[PDB]
Design a protein around this motif. Structure first.
Motif, mmCIF file in Angstrom:
data_model
loop_
_atom_site.group_PDB
_atom_site.id
_atom_site.type_symbol
_atom_site.label_atom_id
_atom_site.label_comp_id
_atom_site.label_asym_id
_atom_site.label_seq_id
_atom_site.Cartn_x
_atom_site.Cartn_y
_atom_site.Cartn_z
ATOM 1 N N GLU D 9 -63.356 7.622 105.231
ATOM 2 C CA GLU D 9 -64.379 6.577 104.791
ATOM 3 C C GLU D 9 -63.361 5.405 104.401
ATOM 4 O O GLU D 9 -63.797 4.164 104.177
ATOM 5 C CB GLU D 9 -64.895 7.178 103.304
ATOM 6 C CG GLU D 9 -65.634 8.368 103.544
ATOM 7 C CD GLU D 9 -66.107 9.005 102.144
ATOM 8 O OE1 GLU D 9 -65.879 8.394 101.156
ATOM 9 O OE2 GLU D 9 -67.124 9.943 102.397
ATOM 10 N N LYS D 10 -61.742 5.689 104.223
ATOM 11 C CA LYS D 10 -61.141 4.523 104.133
ATOM 12 C C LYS D 10 -61.263 3.517 105.194
ATOM 13 O O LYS D 10 -60.708 2.408 105.192
ATOM 14 C CB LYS D 10 -59.561 4.867 104.057
ATOM 15 C CG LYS D 10 -59.300 5.423 102.631
ATOM 16 C CD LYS D 10 -57.973 6.063 102.596
ATOM 17 C CE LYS D 10 -57.775 6.661 101.271
ATOM 18 N NZ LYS D 10 -56.222 7.263 101.049
ATOM 19 N N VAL D 11 -61.650 3.898 106.310
ATOM 20 C CA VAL D 11 -61.858 3.367 107.723
ATOM 21 C C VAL D 11 -62.971 2.120 107.453
ATOM 22 O O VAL D 11 -62.843 1.007 107.876
ATOM 23 C CB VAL D 11 -62.143 3.897 108.781
ATOM 24 C CG1 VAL D 11 -62.386 3.125 110.057
ATOM 25 C CG2 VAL D 11 -60.860 4.988 109.156
#
Ligand SMILES: [Mg+2]
Ligand SMILES: [Mg+2]
Ligand SMILES: [Mg+2]
Ligand SMILES: [Mg+2]
Ligand SMILES: [Mg+2]
Ligand SMILES: [Mg+2]
Ligand SMILES: [Mg+2]
Ligand SMILES: [Mg+2]
Ligand SMILES: [Mg+2]
Ligand SMILES: [Mg+2]
Ligand SMILES: [Mg+2]
Ligand SMILES: [Mg+2]
Ligand SMILES: [Mg+2]
Ligand SMILES: [Mg+2]
Ligand SMILES: [Mg+2]
Ligand SMILES: [Mg+2]
Ligand SMILES: [Mg+2]
Ligand SMILES: [Mg+2]
Ligand SMILES: [Mg+2]
Lengths: 109, 246, 99, 120
Positions: D9-11
């Motif tokens: 999700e950090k992407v």
RNA sequence: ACCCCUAUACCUUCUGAUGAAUUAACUAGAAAUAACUUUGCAAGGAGAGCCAAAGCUAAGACCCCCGAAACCAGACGA
RNA sequence: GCCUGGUGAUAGCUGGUUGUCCAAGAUAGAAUCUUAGUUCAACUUUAAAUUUGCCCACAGAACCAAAUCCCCUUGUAAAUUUAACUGUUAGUCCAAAGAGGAACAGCUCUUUGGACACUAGGAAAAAACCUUGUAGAGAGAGUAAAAAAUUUAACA
RNA sequence: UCUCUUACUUUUAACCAGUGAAAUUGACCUGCCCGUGAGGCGGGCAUAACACAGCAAGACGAGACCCUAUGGAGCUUUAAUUUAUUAAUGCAAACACCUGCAUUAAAAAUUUCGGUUGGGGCGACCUCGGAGCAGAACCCAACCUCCGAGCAGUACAUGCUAAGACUUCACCAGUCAAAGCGAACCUCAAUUGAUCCAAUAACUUGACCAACGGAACAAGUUACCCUAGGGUAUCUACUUUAUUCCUCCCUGUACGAAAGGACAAGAGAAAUAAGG
């Protein structure tokens, strides 16, 4: 010199995942050793297979395992535990959907 | 045909051959489902719904006796003596809403069908027919072109003699002295007051039976129907009369 | 089969023939082919290769003036992208907005 | 084994540097995506072929409008290497029934609701 | 016309050697159980027999060519 | 022996199967005196009836990694059932996880996914790598993949 | 025969005249080098066209060897099945032969000789279960790695029925099961075998049919095997592009310091090759 080992897959595992509507007598899951234990409204066959005893929805939980006192294997496994140590297992429940019948007017005598 | 194999060459093996394992239709035990199939007797059903239907549309005249010839000539029932049909069986379907005073001769009859006919002032009897006799009964006109004298119908076999000699199922060989007890018993069971057939005007019609060893109604065994010049040749030799009136 | 696969190659070979002729004619005026085509697009002169090759052969003054318009635009591209910051744009560098 | 790839999700968490790079606001984001297929589904797994068929991107270089909701964003995250996404920006309003026929989606990403063919 | 550019003969057998000088002629898909389509009539259909819990009758529409070593019978042959 | 007949012997094997045009269409397996073959299944095809299919979010699936199952929304348009049948199967290579082998083989055996037995462009030529798919004409245009880069050693 | 070949005659040949085949042949406008996977594809190079005679490097063209067929044939048997055929007995019939029925021999006759296999063979194996491979739903191979099975024990309601399910990727088989009636108050993983046929009054019972989906009963071998299959020059190209040994001298000097001991160049004699 390695003969044998040609047995096929047993096709075991879970037949009804959690949330699935289930009628009475449906096999929920067939296991070979107790991976899942019968909880509320779930029965067990001779083959350790979990079937359903009511119509409802399958739920899996984690519960305290307290075996029967005549089960000397698991009971001897209890008494070796330290004083806070409590065993858990995963259980399967069927939450029953319907009421088990209604009162209906029959005749105005 | 696809690629060159055995199915292109044209030589695929017989139907049922599973390529070498023992075939489906042979792994399975013989059981006698069809063991005596061609000696079992068959009886075409005629429901009372059907027979009320035939009476309403003029196809079966209820002011005459209803033999099996009258159900064939009205084309109410198709019965085939090969394929070993032994005749008609009455069927209780349409017993309520059956409003007809009738005189039927039907080879089997359920209790509730006897009750539905005998309620309305009717008479049921159960006759027997040989395959030969049944075959002459259904299509009589291709028998009178055959040139043979009318034969005598044979009595039932030992399996069926206890059927046709019981007054409960209205056998044609039973007592006419045990019939009022049976008519009275059905009238008590199914809750209708038993009308006496003796009072009304159709009684002389509702009493007529042909005896055993008589295939057609007004005729006798041993007669030769001459269809052409509309005569009946009757034998007068004593040996033939002992043989035909046996 | 050759007759139908040759429709693709007819189109292809005409186009390379035009690029050869535009290349040759623009090398007569010192330009190269990428300079001419690029800096004519940038003037919103959307002539195509067939027409430019035919002007190169049959109307070489129009072709000379197109090479002058493309090299002028090329220099304004240089001078504009050299003196960077807020400045007046080039004269031939301006575009006509369509709405 | 080659399998379906989860992406963390950090992407998909923008940085203020990226808000300086592209033209986005984290508060008041855009409603509609424009999605275009710019790469082939050939030599791609069958699941990506399917997602391309669901989003309506069978033809390449043809824009398609989608909602900027997490379901559609989930499908877009599966095939984000085959497509191009830009926000549908709308300089004037969304088109009324008067301006319904006379629109044009420009290259910039904007959808103009009065499309004359005259110069300004 | 050629020169320029493009272009790994056809069949068949393999996942991707075979056969053919050429011309002409000859040379290889035969079955209506069940289903389907179209009519007729319809609790009945059918020009007897047969089927029928909308069926039955009629039609249409499906099933290749060449090639052994052999085995047997009877002759003809030193 | 040879001839005639049975005899159009038989051949799971080889070879061959003749107008046009369009459409849909490729890789699980189980048994078998079976592995040059068949049968069932899987896949495929047409017709029919109906109602969901696919993608999926939380929650959920055991003690002794990549992921998957399950799955509402949503994005889509298919799916199941009924009827009727044919055909296809030692696939090959590449990427990945492995087993056997020499951490040899255009070697052998599984799994996941591609591609090829379907087009075109590129990589020298080029089944399988990269780009790219749905079909026609055009002497229009924008693109995709796409060109190998390197040169060295004094010593207080 | 050979070192090592040479000359001549005949034939053949070649040309001229008459006569006039055949195997072969997808089409050819039929080059070299490297590369690919090679007259033809890629990169280079070469390149007027056309006969005639040669050459035989290449193009194009049987006999073996292995495997397969639920394909044949032959040979040998203590393979299987017969004894129809003979020859004997024995018993009946008849009053030794003949006929009938058994039995033993010989002579044969009919038919067969499963599968896996890094081509095949030996060895090993062929069915069922557990674990790894295959880490987390299911499935997943190998002449892959390791264990096992072909039962035993207890009970005699291990009675009868019956919703709903699972399922070894089909089928066949397998499994689980609430409610009910009737009663009390099964463990183990595998622990196994279809149909037909037998046996039995019936209920039931029947294979290491282990080649374990099982043909009711059939071996070795063939280098004699057999069949069907699988693994006389047309074209290109071409047909006149000085070494070595020994001797001798220089010199037995150079060089070394003694032992030792040059080169080079020259003369010789040889031999081979090349050209006459
Ligand atoms: Mg295993
Ligand atoms: Mg297996
Ligand atoms: Mg182009
Ligand atoms: Mg052809
Ligand atoms: Mg003689
Ligand atoms: Mg044949
Ligand atoms: Mg065969
Ligand atoms: Mg198509
Ligand atoms: Mg067998
Ligand atoms: Mg075969
Ligand atoms: Mg759902
Ligand atoms: Mg001559
Ligand atoms: Mg070569
Ligand atoms: Mg060639
Ligand atoms: Mg020559
Ligand atoms: Mg055979
Ligand atoms: Mg299954
Ligand atoms: Mg076997
Ligand atoms: Mg077997």
């Amino acid at each position: 010199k390695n003969l044998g080992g040609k047995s096929s897959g047993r096709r075991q595992g879970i037949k009804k995942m959690e949330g699935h509507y289930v009628h009475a007598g449906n096999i929920i899951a067939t296991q070979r050793h107790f991976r899942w234990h019968p909880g509320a409204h779930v029965g067990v066959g001779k083959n350790k297979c979990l079937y359903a005893l009511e119509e409802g929805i399958v739920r899996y939980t984690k519960e305290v395992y307290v075996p029967h006192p005549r089960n000397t294997e698991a009971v001897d496994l209890i008494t070796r535990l330290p004083k806070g140590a409590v065993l858990y297992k995963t259980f399967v429940h069927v939450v029953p959907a319907k009421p088990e019948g209604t009162f209906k007017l029959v005749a105005m005598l | 045909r696809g690629h060159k194999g055995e199915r292109q060459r044209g030589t695929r093996p017989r139907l049922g051959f599973e390529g070498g394992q023992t075939p489906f239709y042979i792994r399975i035990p013989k059981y006698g489902f069809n063991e005596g199939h061609s000696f079992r007797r068959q009886y075409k059903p005629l429901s009372l719904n059907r027979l009320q239907y035939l009476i309403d549309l003029g196809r079966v005249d209820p002011s005459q006796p209803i033999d099996l010839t009258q159900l064939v000539n009205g084309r109410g029932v198709t019965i085939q003596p090969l394929k070993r049909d032994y005749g008609v069986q009455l069927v209780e379907e349409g017993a309520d809403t059956f409003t007809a005073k009738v005189n039927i001769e039907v080879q089997l009859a359920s209790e509730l069908a006897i009750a539905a006919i005998e309620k309305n002032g009717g008479v049921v009897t159960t006759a027997f027919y040989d395959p030969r006799s049944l075959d002459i009964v259904c299509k009589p006109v291709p028998f009178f072109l055959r040139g043979q004298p009318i034969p005598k119908r044979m009595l039932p076999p030992e399996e069926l003699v206890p059927y046709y000699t019981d007054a409960k199922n209205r056998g044609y060989l039973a007592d006419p002295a045990k019939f009022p007890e049976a008519r009275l018993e059905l009238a008590r069971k199914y809750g209708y007051i038993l009308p006496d057939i003796t009072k009304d005007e159709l009684f002389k019609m509702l009493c007529t039976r042909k005896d055993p060893r008589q295939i057609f109604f007004g005729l006798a065994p041993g007669w030769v129907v001459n269809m052409a010049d509309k005569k009946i040749l009757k034998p007068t030799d004593e040996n033939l009369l002992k043989y035909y009136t046996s | 089969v050759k007759c139908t696969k040759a429709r693709y190659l007819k189109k292809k070979n005409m186009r390379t023939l035009w690029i050869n002729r535009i290349t040759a004619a623009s090398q007569e005026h010192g330009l190269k082919y990428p300079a001419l085509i690029g800096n004519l697009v940038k003037c919103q002169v959307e002539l195509n290769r067939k027409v430019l090759a035919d002007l190169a052969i049959y109307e070489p003054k129009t072709f000379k003036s197109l090479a002058a318009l493309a090299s002028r635009r090329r220099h304004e591209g240089f001078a504009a992208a050299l003196g960077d910051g807020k400045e007046p744009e080039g004269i031939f560098s301006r575009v006509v907005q369509y709405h | 084994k080659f399998t379906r790839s989860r992406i963390p999700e950090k992407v998909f968490q923008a940085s203020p540097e990226d808000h300086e790079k592209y033209g986005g606001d984290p508060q008041n984001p855009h409603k509609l995506h424009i999605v275009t297929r710019i790469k082939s589904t050939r030599r791609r797994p069958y699941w990506e072929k399917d997602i391309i068929k669901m989003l309506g991107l069978e033809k390449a270089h043809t824009p398609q409008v989608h909602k900027n909701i997490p379901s559609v964003n989930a499908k877009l995250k599966v095939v984000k290497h085959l497509i191009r996404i830009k926000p549908l920006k709308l300089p004037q309003g969304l088109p009324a029934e008067e301006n319904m026929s006379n629109t044009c989606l420009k290259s910039t990403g904007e959808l103009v609701v009065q499309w004359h063919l005259k110069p300004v």
